[PDB]
Design a protein around this ligand. Structure first.
Ligand SMILES: O=P(O)(O)Cc1cccc2cccnc12
Ligand SMILES: O=P(O)(O)Cc1cccc2cccnc12
Ligand SMILES: [Zn+2]
Ligand SMILES: [Zn+2]
Ligand SMILES: [Zn+2]
Length: 231
């Protein structure tokens, strides 16, 4: 039922309704000879939509906008990028050209600029310290501490009990670490524990890539990260 890579031609995007007014968007990207899925979030806010993360690239993100327009038909007014990598900011320029106000933390914006990646326009205040949370439209933004990257944010939808982990949370099928070049392996388990302590009532947990699940995905990611730490 949840889409996988073989259902998704490159450059195309699928939407998946998780709860009332809450969808994930799923896309694919090729890299180093393999094909990866990637998730983001869509949250209804009255008669508009809040977008969480791009669909990994300009072409995917334009297709994302066209699919939202076709299937939902409400305007995407704001977007939040949860860290500075391409699967999160790649396509910000397409969003901005479409009239979407793009947002990220000051930490993410600076890291994106140093990396030469696209830079969300607006800066999100109140997220500079581990454990910081701010309301942003229909969601709560949470900075749990460094994990997959030093800037990674997670997103909770209290109306639907949906926790979106971004790349800081692995799907259960992943038994080994992915790209950890920008990770803080020493702090990743502690950051996950902050997520667990702050959202123990979460019912749906969306990883940055692959299949959603329950709160078990948090301990799963800790297990994998700790195993990678020990080589
Ligand atoms: O950097 P990541 O972890 O978020 C995504 C990622 C990077 C490198 C290898 C992977 C293998 C499977 C799934 N994802 C992979
Ligand atoms: O870490 P992610 O997922 O944001 C970006 C990502 C996804 C898949 C493979 C990668 C290899 C190196 C660097 N990034 C990769
Ligand atoms: Zn990343
Ligand atoms: Zn603006
Ligand atoms: Zn990722």
């Amino acid at each position: 039922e949840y889409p996988t890579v073989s259902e998704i031609p490159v450059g195309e995007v699928r939407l998946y309704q998780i709860a009332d007014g809450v969808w994930s968007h799923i896309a694919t990207q090729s890299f180093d000879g393999a094909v990866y899925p990637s998730n983001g979030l869509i949250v209804r806010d009255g008669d508009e939509l809040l977008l969480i993360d791009t669909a990994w690239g300009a072409k995917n993100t334009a297709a994302l906008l066209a699919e939202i327009e076709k299937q939902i038909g409400l305007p995407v007014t704001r977007a939040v990028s949860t860290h500075f990598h391409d699967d999160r900011v790649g396509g910000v320029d397409v969003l901005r050209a479409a009239g979407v106000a793009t947002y990220a933390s000051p930490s993410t914006r600076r890291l994106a600029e140093v990396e030469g990646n696209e830079i969300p326009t607006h800066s999100l205040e109140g997220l500079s310290s581990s454990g910081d949370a701010v309301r942003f439209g229909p969601v709560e933004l949470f900075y749990p501490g460094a994990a997959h990257s030093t800037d990674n944010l997670v997103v909770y939808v209290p109306s639907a009990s949906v926790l979106y982990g971004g790349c800081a949370i692995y799907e259960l099928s992943r038994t080994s670490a992915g790209n950890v070049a920008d990770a803080d392996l020493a702090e990743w388990p502690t950051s996950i524990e902050r997520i667990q302590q702050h959202y123990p009532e979460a019912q749906f947990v969306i990883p940055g890539h692959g299949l959603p699940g329950g709160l078990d995905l948090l301990k799963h990611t800790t297990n994998v990260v700790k195993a990678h730490t020990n080589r």
